[PDB]
Amino acid sequence: SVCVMFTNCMQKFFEATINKFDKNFSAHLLDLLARLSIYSGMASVISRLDFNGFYTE
Amino acid sequence: REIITLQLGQCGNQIGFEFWKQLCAEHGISPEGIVEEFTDRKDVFFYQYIPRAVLLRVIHSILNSPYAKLYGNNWASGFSQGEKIHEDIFDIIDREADGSDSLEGFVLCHSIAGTGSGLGSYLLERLNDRYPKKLVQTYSVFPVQPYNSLLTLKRLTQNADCLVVLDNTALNRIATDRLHIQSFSQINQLVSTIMSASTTTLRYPGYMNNDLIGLIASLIPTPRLHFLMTGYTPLTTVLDVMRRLLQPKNVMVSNHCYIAILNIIQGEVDPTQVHKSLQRIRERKLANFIPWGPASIQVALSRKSPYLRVSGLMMANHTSISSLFERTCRQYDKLRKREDNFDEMDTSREIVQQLIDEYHAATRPDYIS
Amino acid sequence: REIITLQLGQCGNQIGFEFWKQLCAEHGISPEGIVEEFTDRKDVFFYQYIPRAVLLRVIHSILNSPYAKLYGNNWASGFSQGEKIHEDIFDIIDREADGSDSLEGFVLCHSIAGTGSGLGSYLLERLNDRYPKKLVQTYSVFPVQPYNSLLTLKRLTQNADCLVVLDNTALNRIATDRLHIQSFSQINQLVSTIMSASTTTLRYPGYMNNDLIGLIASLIPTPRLHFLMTGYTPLTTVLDVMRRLLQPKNVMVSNHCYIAILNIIQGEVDPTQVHKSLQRIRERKLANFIPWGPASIQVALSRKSPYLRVSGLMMANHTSISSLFERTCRQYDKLRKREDNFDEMDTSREIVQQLIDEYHAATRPDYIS
Amino acid sequence: LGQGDFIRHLMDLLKPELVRPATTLYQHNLTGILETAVRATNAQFDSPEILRRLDVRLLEDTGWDVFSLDYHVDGPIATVFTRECMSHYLRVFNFLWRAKRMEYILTDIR
Ligand SMILES: Nc1nc2c(ncn2[C@@H]2O[C@H](COP(=O)(O)OP(=O)(O)O)[C@@H](O)[C@H]2O)c(=O)[nH]1
Numbered sequence: 001s002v003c004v005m006f007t008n009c010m011q012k013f014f015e016a017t018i019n020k021f022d023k024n025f026s027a028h029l030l031d032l033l034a035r036l037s038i039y040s041g042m043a044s045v046i047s048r049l050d051f052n053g054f055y056t057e
Numbered sequence: 058r059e060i061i062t063l064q065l066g067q068c069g070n071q072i073g074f075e076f077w078k079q080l081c082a083e084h085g086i087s088p089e090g091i092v093e094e095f096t097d098r099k100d101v102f103f104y105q106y107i108p109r110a111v112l113l114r115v116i117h118s119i120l121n122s123p124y125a126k127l128y129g130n131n132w133a134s135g136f137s138q139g140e141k142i143h144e145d146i147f148d149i150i151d152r153e154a155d156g157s158d159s160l161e162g163f164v165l166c167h168s169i170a171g172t173g174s175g176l177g178s179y180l181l182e183r184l185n186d187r188y189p190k191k192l193v194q195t196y197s198v199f200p201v202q203p204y205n206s207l208l209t210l211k212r213l214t215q216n217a218d219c220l221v222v223l224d225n226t227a228l229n230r231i232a233t234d235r236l237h238i239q240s241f242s243q244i245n246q247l248v249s250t251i252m253s254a255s256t257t258t259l260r261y262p263g264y265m266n267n268d269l270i271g272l273i274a275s276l277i278p279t280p281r282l283h284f285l286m287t288g289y290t291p292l293t294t295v296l297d298v299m300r301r302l303l304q305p306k307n308v309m310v311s312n313h314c315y316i317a318i319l320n321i322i323q324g325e326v327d328p329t330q331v332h333k334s335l336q337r338i339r340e341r342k343l344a345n346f347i348p349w350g351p352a353s354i355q356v357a358l359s360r361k362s363p364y365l366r367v368s369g370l371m372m373a374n375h376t377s378i379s380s381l382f383e384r385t386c387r388q389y390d391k392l393r394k395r396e397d398n399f400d401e402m403d404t405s406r407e408i409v410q411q412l413i414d415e416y417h418a419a420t421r422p423d424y425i426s
Numbered sequence: 427r428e429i430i431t432l433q434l435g436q437c438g439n440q441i442g443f444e445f446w447k448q449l450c451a452e453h454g455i456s457p458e459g460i461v462e463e464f465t466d467r468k469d470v471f472f473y474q475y476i477p478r479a480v481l482l483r484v485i486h487s488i489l490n491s492p493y494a495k496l497y498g499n500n501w502a503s504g505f506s507q508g509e510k511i512h513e514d515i516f517d518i519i520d521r522e523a524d525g526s527d528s529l530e531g532f533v534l535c536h537s538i539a540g541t542g543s544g545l546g547s548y549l550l551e552r553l554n555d556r557y558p559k560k561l562v563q564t565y566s567v568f569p570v571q572p573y574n575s576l577l578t579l580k581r582l583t584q585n586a587d588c589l590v591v592l593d594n595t596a597l598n599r600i601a602t603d604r605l606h607i608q609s610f611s612q613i614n615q616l617v618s619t620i621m622s623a624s625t626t627t628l629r630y631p632g633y634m635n636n637d638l639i640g641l642i643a644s645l646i647p648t649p650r651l652h653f654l655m656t657g658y659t660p661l662t663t664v665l666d667v668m669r670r671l672l673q674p675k676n677v678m679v680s681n682h683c684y685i686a687i688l689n690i691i692q693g694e695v696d697p698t699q700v701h702k703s704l705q706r707i708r709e710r711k712l713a714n715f716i717p718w719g720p721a722s723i724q725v726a727l728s729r730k731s732p733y734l735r736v737s738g739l740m741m742a743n744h745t746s747i748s749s750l751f752e753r754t755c756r757q758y759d760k761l762r763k764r765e766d767n768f769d770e771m772d773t774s775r776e777i778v779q780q781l782i783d784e785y786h787a788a789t790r791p792d793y794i795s
Numbered sequence: 796l797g798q799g800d801f802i803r804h805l806m807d808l809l810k811p812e813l814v815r816p817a818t819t820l821y822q823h824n825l826t827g828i829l830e831t832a833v834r835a836t837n838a839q840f841d842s843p844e845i846l847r848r849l850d851v852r853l854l855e856d857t858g859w860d861v862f863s864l865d866y867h868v869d870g871p872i873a874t875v876f877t878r879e880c881m882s883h884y885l886r887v888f889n890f891l892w893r894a895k896r897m898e899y900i901l902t903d904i905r
Pocket residue numbers: 065066067068071072129130168170171172173174198199200225241242244245248
């Protein structure tokens with residue numbers, strides 16, 4: 001939802017809203033890799049999401 | 058979505074004329090513009106078959122070639138004469154634009170080293186005025202010569218939405234190292250191999266990358282860092298090909314890190330060990346990327362033409378491309394201390410310095426702000 | 427893990443070239459570096475096949491050989507010229523190291539008798555500067571010759587992590603005794619057999635000795651006593667091979683006691699009677715061992731190359747090796763009284779005196795402290 | 796451990812993992828490491844069938860106390876091993892694992 005909605009904001013052409021999407025989307029992404037990692041491929045997906053060691057938090 | 062291509066100068070004509078010949082054979086099309094009986098999407102470059110090309114004394118060499126039924130040295134001379142025929146060559150491009158269903162891009166082939174430099178600088182300016190929503194990719198070729206070269210770089214850094222560098226120097230080495238030539242008629246055979254294999258995903262539709270804007274927005278993160286270099290190994294598993302593309306011996310270029318990598322595998326290789334090689338490339342650390350943003354490597358497969366074995370091409374966005382500019386920037390100041398306003402050169406001088414700084418700032422963990 | 431080999435001087439190139447010929451024929455590798463049709467782990471010494479060699483007139487005769495597709499006389503003169511090309515040769519090594527998966531060590535083949543000997547001493551120090559965690563084993567070969575021999579000894583006693591001695595006086599006597607040659611290309615046949623046999627347990631994997639440190643960690647008790655000697659018997663039960671290796675006629679060296687012994691039996695011998703023989707060799711007391719710490723004898727089996735019978739090699743650490751340094755030492759003093767500072771010779775003369783002093787004190791019941 | 800070449804690489808890759816306590820250890824992570832070892836060493840040139848059965852199991856401290864291979868076998872061949880040879884091999888594999896890390900420690904000190 002935050003991805004498609006961010007396209008709408010940029011389509012309306014504020015500076016306090018771009019940074020608002022960042023803290024909202026980056027938090028939602030970290031919830032994904034937290035649940036994708038806790039398992040017994042479903043593990044190789046993480047190697048596809050981050051490749052530069054980013055999101056190592 | 059159709060892509061109308063342009064060819065300027067002796068270079069652009071020769072590479073384009075040999076680009077079409079590589080494409081006409083890769084499809085079942087006779088040089089007489091007639092399909093041979095002998096699945097491949099061919100509506101992007103060809104119009105039902107006629108290629109969508111707008112060329113601009115080498116022209117006579119094409120009209121005598123068997124493919125006849127298929128259609129000074131100052132930068133100021135190129136920009137001046139281009140203004141005198143503003144309405145002439147724009148009549149052709151406009152009549153070729155509306156006749157197409159929905160225009161997508163303008164793949165422009167020109168060398169920045171005589172008239173192709175000054176005329177191409179004129180076109181890339183005029184296209185952004187009338188056509189503001191059309192991508193303009195350029196297959197520019199790198200070689201008073203320092204002057205005409207950098208002046209085009211002023212336009213190529215703010216108008217062209219993409220750029221693929223192909224320098225004759227690094228090509229001449231590969232011409233000497235693995236081909237043992239010592240000629241233009243030979244190095245262009247390698248250029249035509251790079252241009253044709255670049256748009257292999259548009260002509261052969263797969264899961265993704267069915268439009269030019271799909272190949273562009275993935276690599277180029279910001280409007281400024283829009284320079285790409287190529288790598289082509291075949292001159293065997295996917296690991297054999299992926300390891301050879303990252304060697305500096307194969308790149309067509311004479312700290313530093315990558316920004317985005319796209320691999321084109323035109324083989325019949327099974328798509329099950331693909332993720333295994335990418336997994337291995339991460340382990341041995343054969344390439345490094347930017348530290349600030351999340352940079353990943355992408356690999357794409359395709360299908361070779363049955364009318365014509367594993368190959369491989371890599372689209373790279375490397376910061377080490379900044380080196381080629383400095384060679385141009387350096388020789389300019391030397392010619393600036395050796396000899397109506399002479400302000401365009403200095404204004405162009407400033408913006409190239411802004412670009413090089415942006416590259417060397419791209420390798421910093423605080424490239425933001 | 428991989429091991430990069432270096433070949434310095436006329437001797438290093440020759441014995442290294444003969445080492446690779448024997449190692450290629452031992453495997454299924456055509457002279458064109460292509461695998462023939464015709465288990466043996468060959469990733470350590472061959473790169474996917476390319477040898478991991480760094481060669482340094484003789485090169486031309488190698489390039490005119492059928493194996494072309496497989497890739498002054500002072501010590502100060504040999505040291506300085508290496509300093510002026512310091513950056514040059516390391517680029518070859520730096521790319522081969524990082525191009526390697528996980529580097530383990532540096533095999534050096536060189537003769538200490540003079541440009542190659544001088545270059546070797548230079549490179550042995552720099553490898554300690556750059557790479558601190560890589561073993562350096564040197565297959566040195568003994569013969570103004572006294573000068574150069576002791577200088578390189580000053581570096582080989584504190585830089586090289588291990589060392590295997592091969593003196594020409596012991597090899598030449600063998601060629602006239604059991605081969606009846608009366609040439610360099612003839613004695614190198616024996617040197618190649620010892621070198622190829624030394625790394626046998628690395629290429630044919632077994633339950634033990636799957637890494638270069640596994641062979642060295644048993645013999646060398648302290649970092650100072652890092653000199654070894656060899657023995658090769660067939661020039662058949664396992665008890666026969668052990669008894670023939672412990673005879674003085676076979677060792678390649680011109681009180682005292684053993685520190686550690688390693689036996690390599692390369693035949694198809696019965697592996698159940700190997701533990702029996704070590705029970706009986708202990709009873710006859712054919713070798714005298716150190717009194718301070720515990721020491722034993724080691725036997726390791728392997729498999730001969732089927733593409734090419736019982737052989738045997740013995741790596742020992744005998745304190746009688748101190749005599750060889752004494753000859754070079756005494757030979758130096760006689761020239762020092764006969765003819766910018768000449769202070770390096772003084773330090774080298776002093777440090778080798780401590781090494782000799784370690785050996786003679788290594789045979790006492792109180793070598794502890 | 797009769798291979799030697801494969802167990803060497805396998806002890807170099809599990810070093811960064813097993814040093815942590817067992818509570819943070821989960822089986823789904825180690826399999827990618829084991830699969831990496833079988834690919835790098837000489838064990839890649841091997842029958843694909845027998846490689847399908849070789850996996851990991853987690854005994855139930857430290858990572859060097861709960862790791863062990865299993866090589867489960869079911870079907871007709873399971874009448875030769877009979878759940879007792881698999882309860883004896885693991886009883887052996889510990890003694891060969893300890894006497895293998897007590898050696899790679901002593902070649903690291905050296
Ligand atoms: N790669 C390549 N470059 C070429 C070829 N022909 C010409 N060029 C380049 O084009 C430049 C000359 O441009 P020129 O023909 O004088 O432009 P014109 O004044 O418009 O005709 C040279 O610096 C070459 O580097 C070719 O066949 N291959």
